[PDB]
Amino acid sequence: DEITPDLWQEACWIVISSYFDEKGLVRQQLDSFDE
């Protein structure tokens, strides 16, 4: 339904973890060179 405050801390870091699973940390350098 909705993310309650008692679950927000777990939820937000699952979103953050997924972001770095997809992008990493040097995605800017590699994306720029690929272009």
Number of residues forming the site for another protein (CB under 8 A)? 33
Least separation in angstroms between residue 5's CB and another protein is 4
Window 9-28: residues binding another protein (CB under 8 A): 9-28
The two structure tokens encoding residue 34: 């690929």
Least separation in angstroms between residue 35's CB and another protein is 5
Q: What angle do CA 8, 6, 25 make, to 5 degrees?
A: 25
Positions in the binding site for another protein (CB under 8 A):
1-3, 5, 7-35
